[PDB]
Structure 1
Amino acid sequence: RSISLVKSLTFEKERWLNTTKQFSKTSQELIGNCIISSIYETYFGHLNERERGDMLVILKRLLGKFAVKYDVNYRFIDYLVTLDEKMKWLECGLDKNDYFLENMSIVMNSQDAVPFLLDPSSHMITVISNYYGNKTVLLSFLEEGFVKRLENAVRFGSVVIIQDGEFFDPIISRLISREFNHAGNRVTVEIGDHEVDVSGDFKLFIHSCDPSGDIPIFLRSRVRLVHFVTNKESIETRIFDITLTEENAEMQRKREDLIKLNTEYRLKLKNLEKRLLEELNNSQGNMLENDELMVTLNNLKKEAMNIEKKLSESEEFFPQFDNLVEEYSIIGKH
């Protein structure tokens, strides 16, 4: 029993040994990666791709001058975004573009500042509504009855999106600044003409679909402005998807199914590896002494082999779709 399990776990031994040897490099590069990520969230919300590239060049130069190491292969998405976030966001209707994904992570990790979303297509209204599913309120600065409905949303804790953000009403200023009275065991906010209990589950978004609008200084300086606009690759992806669904729908379905199933397989295998290390960690004794642990790790290895086998077998068909994609790059470019 013991020899068989350790022989099976030799793979994890090798991976673990490599990880602990890379620990030194991993710790050296942590501060630089954190600096890059914090700057990227703080400054790049309202920049295009080229501007982000330029600013990352400047920041890497500053990191070099002041002797702070960083991952030369740093990527914002890979560093901060995990599989669960990617899958849920795409399932809610998010575009597959890297630019939209980066902006999505930025707006979802705005824990302290009210996010202000510029989306000319009002796609993010749909995405956010699908994400929260229900208990989502759509108000507008441009309609009557705004104050009362916002008061109720505050009191009960619904997720509010206020449309037409260019018509910002300072009557809700205390929400933007988050200047609350911590009244003993309660937290309240002064809005309109009186004090309203903040449930604590209340979340606020401001949305505008009018680019180059007018955001006053008070709101502009206190919100995390994120632009959700299309680019080359989004247009080309949509054009190809239309081309493929019109020309050959069966390959469309097979491609989508393969992609979804492989991503789920990857997530399952990752979580299984995590469980293996946690189970071996909390042994309460030697592995031989704990026979239940031995059985558990054997079963986990069996599951891992099955998952990896399924992914490896399914992947063999995806180059067919690669060639099918290359067939229509002409339409994409033009």
Structure 2
Amino acid sequence: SQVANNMVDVIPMEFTDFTIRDAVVNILIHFDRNFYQKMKVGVNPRSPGYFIDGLRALVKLVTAKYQDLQENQRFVNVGLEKLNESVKSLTFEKERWLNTTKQFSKTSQELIGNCIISSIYETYFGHLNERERADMLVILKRLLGKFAVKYDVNYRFIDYLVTLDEKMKWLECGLDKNDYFLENMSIVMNSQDAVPFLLDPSSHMITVISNYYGNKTVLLSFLEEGFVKRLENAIRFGSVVII
């Protein structure tokens, strides 16, 4: 809690039901406590890591989402001044557009708790099973249910962090159709504050990322002789490397 608090010291947030910062930190602790308790087996070999990186994901994600919520709120406010200047038959329906204006407050209510789920997916879920992910999500959602944070009930990790332009780009390279494989690719790309470890039997992934970075893609393996030097050349001139 001491560490969590100082990491979310930066305060994007606005008043909620119930404290707001105090709630967020208590969730993440109760999630980390539930993650290792359900998933990991063996007696107390492993300890807090994902927790730090889960907080770091949230900070990067709230900042990215609150600045984009305020950007779309600015896009409907600039359209409000332009329709009022004009006032004719259809334009008064457009003015009515307070349904959207009313909608924004409800959208902003859930963005803090939506970022909680998105960060947890990026950090805790990467190596979990189709069923293992879904089941933890429920424990997270019911934790989000106990605490007075609002989340989107009809929420989908893919649609929330993937853009249709990127989702097309990935498949074009040759990523598989599956939801599981989409989430995985999203987890790899979206957050790169840390090096990703891709595990796939069929090295079909080693080509996917190659198609995406093209010429820039320089391939190495920890086993080759020239590895020691070839990485120093890859780092010096911005080469995208897969090991």
Which range, TM-score by smaller chain? 0.5 to 0.7
- Cα shift readout 1:266-317 (whole Å, capped 9, x = no counterpart): xxxxxxxxxxxxxxxxxxxxxxxxxxxxxxxxxxxxxxxxxxxxxxxxxxxx
Q: 2:217 aligns with which of 133, 136, 142?
A: 136
Question: Quick one: which amino acid aligns to residue 98 of structure 1?
Answer: D
**Aligned partner of 1:23 among 94, 104, 116:** 104
Could you say if the C-alpha distance between residues 13 and 55 of structure 1 is closer, same or farther in structure 2, counting changes exceeding 3 Å? Answer: same
Q: Tell me, in whole angstroms, the C-alpha distance in 1 between the residues paired with 2:99 and 2:166.
A: 27
Give the 4+ runs in structure 1 shifted more than 2 A. 2-14
For residues 4-43 of structure 1, the aligned pairs below 5 Å read 6-7=88-89, 9=91, 12-13=94-95, 16-43=97-124
- Report which of the two structures shows the higher radius of gyration computed on alpha carbons: 1
Query: Equivalences for 1:49-88 in 2 at 5 Å?
Result: 49-88=130-169
Partner of 2:241: 160
When residues 6 and 85 of structure 1 are mapped into structure 2, their CA distance, relative to the original with a 3 A threshold, is: farther
Determine the C-alpha separation between the residues in 1 that align with 2:86 and 2:146: 53
How does 1:79-98 map onto structure 2 within 5 Å?
Answer: 79-98=160-179
Q: Which residue, out of 178, 189, 195, partners 1:114?
A: 195
1:151 corresponds to: 232
Rate the CA distance shift 1:127–1:10 in 2: closer, same or farther, 3 A: farther
Quote how far apart the aligned CAs of 1:9 are: 4.8
**Equivalent position amino acid for 2:227 in 1:** F
Residue 236 of structure 2 aligns with an amino acid whose one-letter code is: R
Instruction: Using the TM superposition, give the Cα deviation of residue 156 of structure 1 relative to its aligned residue in structure 2, in angstroms.
Output: 0.5
- The match for 1:125 is 206
Find the counterpart in structure 1 of residue 6 from structure 2. none
- Listed as ranges, the gaps of 5+ residues in structure 1 are 163-334
In structure 2, the residue corresponding to 1:33 is in which secondary structure? helix
Amino acid at match of 2:130: E
Q: 1:133 to 1:13 in 2, by over 3 A?
A: farther
Q: 1:152 deviation in Å?
A: 0.4
Q: 3-state SS of the aligned residue for 1:134?
A: helix
Instruction: Quickly say closer, same or farther: Cα 1:5–1:148, change in 2 above 3 A.
Output: farther
Shift of residue 71 of structure 1? 0.6
1:4 positional shift: 10
Q: How many Å separate the matches in 2 of 1:57 and 1:105?
A: 20
Q: Report the alpha carbon displacement of residue 17 of structure 1 after superposing the two structures with TM.
A: 2.5
List gaps (5 residues or longer) in structure 2: 1-82
CA RMSD of aligned residues (A): 2.1
Equivalents in 2 of 1:11, 1:139: separation in Å? Answer: 60
SS in structure 2 at match of 1:71: coil
The two structures have a TM-score, normalised by structure 2, of: 0.61
Identity of matched residues, %: 91
Deviation string 1:75-118 (CA, Å, 9 cap, x unpaired) is 10111111111111111211221111111110002221100001
